[model samples]
Target: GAIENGLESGSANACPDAILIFARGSTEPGNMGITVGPALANGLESHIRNIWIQGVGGPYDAALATNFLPRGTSQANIDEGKRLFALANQKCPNTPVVAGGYSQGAALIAAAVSELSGAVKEQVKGVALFGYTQNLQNRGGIPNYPRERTKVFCNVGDAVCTGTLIITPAHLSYTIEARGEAARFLRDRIR
Candidate 1:
C-alpha cells in the first residue's frame, strides 16, 4: 500500500536518472512532501527524470504522539524509507539517490541514512532537509555527509529545528527558498 501510493504519481516506465525520497512534516497529509519534490523536479525536468518516494504522512494525533513518545510514526517512516531506497537501488543500480524531508520527515531521512551501509551511502547524491528537529540532530541521527552534498535549511526563528518546543511562522515559510536551494543542489549532483 505504501509503496504503491509512492509509485502512483510516477509511471512504470519511468527510468529516472535520480530519485528523491521525501518525508512529510508531522501530521501533514502529503502537501509539504508533494510541494518539495515538484519544486526540485521542476528545475531539472529537462535534464533528468526523477521518481519521488512519498513517506507516510499520517494524522496529527498519531504523528505527533510518536514524535513526543518513543517508537512512533517517525520510526515507521524511516523503515519504509529504507525499504523504498533498497527497491530503487535494485531497479536502477547506477541511478543517484537524493533524500529530503521537512520537520519529522527530515528526522526520518536522517535515521534511514544512518542505517545505510557504506556502499549504499555512496549512492546517495545528496540530502536536503528543512525544519529538521534539533533534538534529532543532537541525538546523532543526522549523518556527516559532505557540506557540498547536504543542505539543511532551518529558518532562523523556527524552534522546531532549534531544540525548542515553540512553533513559529518561520516553520511554515520554507517553501520558496528551500525549494530553490534544493533544486540547485539536486541539479549540481545530477551533473
Candidate 2:
C-alpha cells in the first residue's frame, strides 16, 4: 500500500528535494489544518520545487485538553508521530528530512523525534514547532536535543508556549506570523 500524501494532494512516486513530516494542531480538520500545515506548506513551496509534505496520522485530537494537566505529553500521539519520521527517512534516504508541528502537534513531534533510533534519527535535518504546549515543563527543551537545528515558535500571548493555560489570539496567529519563518528555517537546513 502507498502512504498518503497531503500537500497539494500527491503521492511520492520518486524522491523529493526535501520532505516535511508535520503533525497538525489539535482539532485541525483532517491530518493537516487550514492554517497550521498548509501555510507552512505554501511557504515551503515558494522556495523549493520538489518537496514532500505529510502530516502524522490522526490522534491530533485529545492532546490539547490533556496538555493542561501536569502529565501533558500525549504518548499516543508521539507513538503515531515518531513512525512517520522513521518511515519517511527510510523511504527517502536521499532526501533531507525535517519535522514540523503546531500546538499539540508541536509537543507531540518534539518528543517523538527524540525517540527515534540513533541511526534513523541522525537522518533528521531539523525539528520545527509552533505554540508548543509543554514549553513550561520542558523548560529549556529536551536536554538531549541541542538547540542547534530545533526551532520552537512561541508568541508572547500564546499561553500554550508560555506556561499559561489560556489560548490567546496570538496563539493561533502562527499562520500569519511564523509561516514564512518556519518555512525558511526548514528550507535552509535541508538545502
Candidate 3:
C-alpha cells in the first residue's frame, strides 16, 4: 500500500469475482521482485477465479526511518493496512477477498488483521503469509476470524524472515506460534 506501482484499482474484469490483493515485502517498490508477475496471477485465475489487485510497495523495504517507527509497530504499516482494506471494501463490497504478502508485508497483514473490526474481518476469506516471525497469540481484544482461512508458510532456513526472532528482540517469534496454531485449526476447521 505504501510502495507505488503494481496496484490495480478499477479493473473492468474485476468484481463479480473474488480479489487477490497481492502485497509486496521490503523496500523496493517497482522492481520485478517486488511486484507479483502477471503469469502467477493468470495461473491462479484458472482455479481461484479472481481478479488480481495489487497493494504493494511497503515502507519496510524502503528503510525510511521517518516513514516508519523505531519499531516494527509503525504508524505507516497500520495506515497501509487500513487503506488497503478500505479500498477493497469500496471497490468490491460483498465479495470475498484474500490477502497475501511476504516478509515485512506479511507482518503488516498480521498487524492489520488484528486491528480489523469483526464486520470488516468477515470479508477476508484467507491470509497467505511468507517469512512471518510474529505469532498470533492471545491478541484477545483484536477480533480474528477462524484460523481455517489463514495460511502461513515459513522455511527454517529463511533467517531474514523466519520464526526465530520477533520484531522486538525481547519478543519471541510468533511465526512458530502461528504455524502450530494453524495446524490445530486446520484439524478442526477442515472437518
Candidate 4:
C-alpha cells in the first residue's frame, strides 16, 4: 500500500515566507497528538507566514498505536515523498521549507532528502530529525549533510534511535526537542 496524504492546511497562502511541514512519527496520522494539537497549529500559524503540515503513514487498525508503513525503506513511501516534495515546491515557490519528522517519518524524510537532486535539496531550509539512527551507515555515497541545514538527534535510551530493537522506546523527549529546534531554526532564518 502507498502512503496516505493526511490533513494539510494553508496550501494557498503565500504570505508566510516560512513553511512547516510536520511529518508525524509511526502512527495513524489522526492519532498524532503533538502535530494535531491546537497549540501546534496555533504556534505555527502565529509565527509562520505560510505553514503546510503533511502526514505520511497510518496504522492498519484504528486502535493500533503503531504504524504499518513497512519495514526499512519502501518504494511506495519514497514515491509518495517525491510527490509531496514536488507539490510543496509547486505550491510554495521561493518559500523556505522546513521538514520535521519523528521516528519512521524522520527516516522517510531522510531517505527523501537523500534521493533529492541538488537543486531541490538546496531549497530545503533544514531538516529536524528525531529518533534517527546512525546504523544505516552505508547510504551509498550519501554525504554527511552539513549541520547548518540538517540537524539529527537521537535519544540514547531509545532502542529505535539506535535502529536495533524492533520496538524501541518512543523518544517523545527527542521529538519535543526537535520541535523546539525547528522553531528556533525558522525564527533565525526569518529574522
Candidate 5:
C-alpha cells in the first residue's frame, strides 16, 4: 500500500481517472502543505486509481496587504485557481475534478470557485475547503456555485472561519481530526 503522496506529482499521468487541484496555506511551502491539502486528498488516493494531484502555485502571503483585507485573498491567486480549473478541463476533459485547500488557500479557492463559469462548474465534481470562511456569501464563497458540490470544513472554534482572522487549535488539527470525514465526503462525490 504505497500511498503516493507527492505534491505537484505532474502531467505524466495526464487524463488520469480523476484530478485534484489543491492550494497550500500561507508560509506552508511544498505546495501541498502540511495540513489539509495533502492530508485530506492523499487519503482519497488510496481509494482511487490514476488520480493526479496538482498543487496550486500562488503567493499565499500571510501579511496584511494580500490576505487580511475585508474582502479576503488577492485577485491574482483567485484568477490562478480559475485558470487551473480551465486547465484541468483542457488536459483531461473526461476526468472529474476535486478541488481542496487549507486556511488562506481555502479562502482563495472559495473565491475562485465562486467566480467559475457555469461550464467549468460542471467539471468540478466536488470542492472541499478546510479552515474556510463560514459566511459563504460574504467572504468570497457561494453566489455562482452550487451548495451541493462544496463542503467547507470550519471546525468548532476556528476563529478564521467565523471571519475573525485568528488561527486556533481546531484550525490546525484538521489533518488529524478532519481528513477521515473530508476524504469520505470527497470520495463519495467523485464522478
Candidate 6:
C-alpha cells in the first residue's frame, strides 16, 4: 500500500500508538522547514516507539503568484496532506495521530484537518503549527481541532503571522524550545 511504502522504514509494519504527519514549509531547496517536526519526534521517540515522520514537499515557488494567488500551489499541498492523513488513519485505525507543519506547511496541515471526517478527526490527537501565516485568515488560522489539542507557535515578531510581508529572525526560530513543548504535547496526548 502507498501508506506502508511511505513509512520511515520498509519493515515498519507494526502499528504505532502514535503517528505524526508533518509538512514542510514552501522553499525552493525543499529542506528549509525540516527541523521542528522531527525534533519533536526525536524527543518522544524514547517514549513512543513506532512513530513515522512523513514530509510533504510541493511546488514551493514562494512567489505571490504561485503561493498566495487564487488556487495556487498551496492548495495542491493541502490536498496531498489530506490524502496522507486519511491514508494514515485507514492504515492505523487505533493509533493516535498528530499533524503539524511550519509556515505554508502549517497551513497545509490545518487545511487537511479541517477536511477530515468526524471519525478521523477523533483519531487525531493534536496539531502543532509554527510561523503560520496570519494574513490569509481564510487559510491560515488554527484548524478545527479542539483548542486545547492544538498549538500555534508564532514567534514574537514573526511578520508572517503578524500581517507583514517581511521574514524576521523570529520566523526562523521555533526550534530551541518549541520542539520540547511539541514533544510533551504528543506525549501527554498518548497518556
For model 5, residues 31-61, the per-residue Cα lDDT tens digits are 6766677677668887786788777774544
Clashing pairs in 3: 3-57, 26-61, 27-61, 27-62, 133-175, 134-174, 135-174
Provide the lowest-lDDT 10-residue window in model 2: 1-10
Q: How do the predictions measure up, each by TM-score?
A: 0.77, 0.85, 0.64, 0.71, 0.85, 0.80
Query: Largest TM-score belongs to which candidate?
Result: 2
Candidate with better TM-score, 1 vs 6 = 6
Pairs that collide, model 2: none
On residues 12-116, what C-alpha lDDT tens digit does candidate 4 reach at each position?
A: 554256655544554434523343222333444556654555555332122223233443445566566656666667666676666655555565667676777
lDDT (C-alpha) at residue 127 in model 5: 81
How well does model 2 score by local distance difference test?
0.71
Top lDDT model: 2
Better of 1 and 3 by lDDT: 1
Per-residue alpha-carbon lDDT of model 6 for 43-156, expressed as tens digits? Answer: 667677767666664443343443464322367766777777777767777778877676666666777787787888888888878777642574445546677788788775
Root-mean-square deviation per candidate:
4.1, 3.5, 7.2, 5.3, 3.4, 4.1
lDDT of 5 at 92: 68
Candidate 5: residue 116 lDDT (0-100): 82
* Model 4: residues with Cα > 4 Å off, grouped in runs: 1-15, 31-46, 57-71, 134-144
Which residues of candidate 5, in runs, are more than 4 Å off? 1-14, 59-64, 134-141
TM-score of 1: 0.77
Candidate 1 yields a Cα-based lDDT of: 0.61
Residue 102 alpha-carbon offset, candidate 4, angstroms: 1.0
Order the candidates by lDDT, highest first.
2, 5, 6, 1, 4, 3
Q: In candidate 6, which residue ranges exceed 4 Å CA deviation? A: 1-13, 28-32, 58-65, 70-73, 135-141
